[PDB]
Amino acid sequence: KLVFFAENVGS
Amino acid sequence: KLVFFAENVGS
Amino acid sequence: KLVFFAENVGS
Amino acid sequence: KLVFFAENVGS
Amino acid sequence: KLVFFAENVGS
Amino acid sequence: KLVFFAENVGS
Amino acid sequence: KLVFFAENVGS
Amino acid sequence: KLVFFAENVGS
Amino acid sequence: KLVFFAENVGS
Amino acid sequence: KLVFFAENVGS
Amino acid sequence: KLVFFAENVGS
Amino acid sequence: KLVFFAENVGS
């Protein structure tokens, strides 16, 4: 099992 | 059994 | 960005 | 994006 | 028995 | 991309 | 900027 | 980019 | 498991 | 069994 | 930048 | 098992 999550809400 | 899921709602 | 993979296969 | 595969075959 | 799976949703 | 092969043959 | 990765795969 | 391969073949 | 988080609200 | 996963969301 | 590889193959 | 992760948010 493998899970990747990325988000960019950077200032 | 194999399951792949991907979604891109990135900001 | 979400990527998920799961596998259960005899090897 | 969803991809699913399942198999039960004697080998 | 042999199973191959590949996916490219790369950023 | 999915490739599956299974075989049960006496040899 | 958030990056997350988790994996549980026998090796 | 995901690549998966599994095999169970007597040798 | 791996988690990375970065933010820049610097003055 | 072999699993490869790569992602590039680098800043 | 994320690169993951796992393998369990008798040798 | 091998995991590589790199990020550059340097000032």
Curated annotation (Swiss-Prot), chains A, B, C, D, E, F, G, H, I, J, K, L:
It comes from the Eukaryota. Changing V9C: Causes formation of an artifactual disulfide bond with PSEN1. The record marks K1, L2, F4, F5 as: Cleavage. This is P3(40). It comes from Homo sapiens. The gene is APP. The chain holds residues 687 to 697 of 770 of the full protein.
